[PDB]
Amino acid sequence: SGFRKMAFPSGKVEGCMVQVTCGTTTLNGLWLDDVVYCPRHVICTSEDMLNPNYEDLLIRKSNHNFLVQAGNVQLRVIGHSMQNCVLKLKVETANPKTPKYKFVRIQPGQTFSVLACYNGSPSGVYQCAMRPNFTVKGSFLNGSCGSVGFNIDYDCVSFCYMHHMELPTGVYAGTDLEGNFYGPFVDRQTAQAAGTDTTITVNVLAWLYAAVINGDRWFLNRFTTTLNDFNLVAMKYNYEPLTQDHVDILGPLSAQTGIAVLDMCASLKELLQNGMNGRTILGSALLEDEFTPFDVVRQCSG
Amino acid sequence: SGFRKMAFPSGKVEGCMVQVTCGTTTLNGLWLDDVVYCPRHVICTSEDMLNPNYEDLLIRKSNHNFLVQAGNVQLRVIGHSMQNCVLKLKVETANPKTPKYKFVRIQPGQTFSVLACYNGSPSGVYQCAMRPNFTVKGSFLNGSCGSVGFNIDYDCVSFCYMHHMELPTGVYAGTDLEGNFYGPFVDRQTAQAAGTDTTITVNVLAWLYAAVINGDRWFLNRFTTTLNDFNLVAMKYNYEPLTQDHVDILGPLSAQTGIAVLDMCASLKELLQNGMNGRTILGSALLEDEFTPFDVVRQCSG
Numbered sequence: 001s002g003f004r005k006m007a008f009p010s011g012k013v014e015g016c017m018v019q020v021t022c023g024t025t026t027l028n029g030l031w032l033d034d035v036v037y038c039p040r041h042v043i044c045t046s047e048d049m050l051n052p053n054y055e056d057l058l059i060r061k062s063n064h065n066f067l068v069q070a071g072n073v074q075l076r077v078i079g080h081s082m083q084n085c086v087l088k089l090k091v092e093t094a095n096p097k098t099p100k101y102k103f104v105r106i107q108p109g110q111t112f113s114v115l116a117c118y119n120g121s122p123s124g125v126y127q128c129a130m131r132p133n134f135t136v137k138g139s140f141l142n143g144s145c146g147s148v149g150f151n152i153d154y155d156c157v158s159f160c161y162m163h164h165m166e167l168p169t170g171v172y173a174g175t176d177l178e179g180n181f182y183g184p185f186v187d188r189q190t191a192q193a194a195g196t197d198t199t200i201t202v203n204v205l206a207w208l209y210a211a212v213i214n215g216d217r218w219f220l221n222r223f224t225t226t227l228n229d230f231n232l233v234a235m236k237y238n239y240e241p242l243t244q245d246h247v248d249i250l251g252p253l254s255a256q257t258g259i260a261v262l263d264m265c266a267s268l269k270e271l272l273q274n275g276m277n278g279r280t281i282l283g284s285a286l287l288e289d290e291f292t293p294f295d296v297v298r299q300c301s302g
Numbered sequence: 303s304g305f306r307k308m309a310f311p312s313g314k315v316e317g318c319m320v321q322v323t324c325g326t327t328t329l330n331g332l333w334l335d336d337v338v339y340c341p342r343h344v345i346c347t348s349e350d351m352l353n354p355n356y357e358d359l360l361i362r363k364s365n366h367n368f369l370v371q372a373g374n375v376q377l378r379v380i381g382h383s384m385q386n387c388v389l390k391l392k393v394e395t396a397n398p399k400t401p402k403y404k405f406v407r408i409q410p411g412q413t414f415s416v417l418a419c420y421n422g423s424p425s426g427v428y429q430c431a432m433r434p435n436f437t438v439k440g441s442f443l444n445g446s447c448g449s450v451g452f453n454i455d456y457d458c459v460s461f462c463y464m465h466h467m468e469l470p471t472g473v474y475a476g477t478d479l480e481g482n483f484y485g486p487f488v489d490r491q492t493a494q495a496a497g498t499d500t501t502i503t504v505n506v507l508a509w510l511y512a513a514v515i516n517g518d519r520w521f522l523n524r525f526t527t528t529l530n531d532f533n534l535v536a537m538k539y540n541y542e543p544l545t546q547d548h549v550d551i552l553g554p555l556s557a558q559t560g561i562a563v564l565d566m567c568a569s570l571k572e573l574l575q576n577g578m579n580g581r582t583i584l585g586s587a588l589l590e591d592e593f594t595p596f597d598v599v600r601q602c603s604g
């Protein structure tokens with residue numbers, strides 16, 4: 001037995017993190033080849049953030065209004081340009097630590113690692129999920145902005161998230177590395193509703209498989225259910241509906257444990273209806289939804 | 303609001319991890335200057351592990367029985383030697399990625415990051431605590447051995463743990479980087495009792511401060527207590543006794559929140575006696591003890 005929330009090793013991302021300063025605002029930037037990527041709101045004053053015209057604000061700014069440090073190395077900004085909500089600062093020097101990378105837009109319920117940074121220096125790494133309502137439940141203090149989320153696939157760093165905003169309701173929102181927000185959010189200090197979150201049903205089932213593999217079996221019961229029966233119970237408890245694609249994705253875990261996916265759904269159903277009766281599963285007293293089936297396979301097979 | 307279990311960035315440790323093979327056994331090694339450190343049990347056969355004489359087993363082994371890979375780079379073992387339970391393999395080449403480092407022996411209830419590795423390749427990073435019974439509740443699959451725990455202080459990687467054993471009771475045990483086990487454990491496949499674990503009282507109080515700072519206040523009550531009153535309740539619920547040193551260490555968190563340490567103990571007391579009544583604190587339904595006061599300060603101040 002043994003199963004923890006695991007982040008990807010952060011070394012490949014650490015050598016890409018820089019410090020971006022505009023006026024009283026300093027936050028984080030991502031230096032890949034000759035381009036530093038950061039939130040375009042670095043160019044805003046506390047005042048501007050209320051109702052920014054980023055076209056007109058970006059026109060008033062000059063190269064030299066951007067102060068980009070990497071440890072010591074002051075990097076010289078030789079151009080500035082806007083892609084949706086991300087600022088691209090062109091610099092004189094191509095990062096010699098630039099890993100093999102792609103930019104990807106992930107789906108809701110997928111996980112990624114965040115390298116949490118303050119003034120362009122890495123502080124910590126943690127594992128996150130994209131909530132179904134396209135928010136992130138994270139740790140971002142006041143200069144955490146422009147910190148990035150990522151996955152490592154074979155030899156390639158897949159950058160999927162850049163941190164932009166804390167919402168007045170104390171949740172986080174941000175963009176892909178092309179500057180398109182996840183969810184309905186805008187880079188403006190206004191009231192913005194996240195709307196109803198749900199629990200990532202396929203993740204909870206992945207985690208129940210993780211629990212069986214690590215010896216935790218009390219919640220296995222003598223029932224199956226159909227997808228319809230289950231989804232009627234899911235909808236009552238604000239669980240995401242389960243699709244046949246979800247059942248297909250859980251197949252290997254099914255095969256490893258000899259427990260059919262609908263058998264495990266019948267377990268989940270009872271846990272939703274009667275709670276845990278004061279017991280725990282993998283040392284937790286609530287149902288965990290921030291492990292994907294892929295995360296559980298990786299950790300339960302190396 | 304926002305508070306997650308955070309590991310240290312792992313980049314400085316990633317460039318030190320190698321693959322060590324002896325016979326059918328391959329595990330992980332830590333390459334600092336011209337020395338690879340791994341568990342001495344790499345030299346054991348499944349059979350030997352039952353009752354190993356490591357002096358006599360190490361004498362039969364030659365340099366060339368040790369196969370040490372770093373990515374590609376086959377490293378040539380030019381000597382082999384034993385310090386308590388750690389094997390030091392001398393190699394021809396000094397790691398050009400050797401960070402500034404120290405070896406430290408941590409106390410029970412302190413935290414550290416583990417870079418979890420399989421065949422000398424980093425898989426993941428997670429935050430751990432040294433349990434009061436000197437075990438680690440972690441994720442170590444069958445080639446996770448020789449993976450290391452560490453802290454980063456200013457510019458210095460402080461290596462504090464090397465993974466050696468899973469105990470038949472499914473918990474983990476290992477050594478400092480001088481090869482002295484934490485706790486009563488030996489590197490022999492026998493039955494070994496961990497003995498009674500307790501909850502790290504000072505950590506739970508640190509985490510209740512974290513909860514107040516991030517807006518979670520339902521459990522604040524109108525009571526104080528003395529250290530004696532509290533420790534009588536602690537001992538019943540297998541909590542570590544709280545000392546004046548513990549109260550001293552929580553001072554800054556006390557000052558930040560305007561809540562006296564004994565006031566928070568009076569909160570903890572009620573939570574131990576009546577449970578949570580089906581509520582949560584920082585999204586958890588049980589009391590968390592794997593954040594130190596130092597971890598909470600770092601995360602609630604950058």
Ligand SMILES: [Cl-]
Pocket residue numbers: 283284285286585586587588
């Ligand atoms: Cl919990």
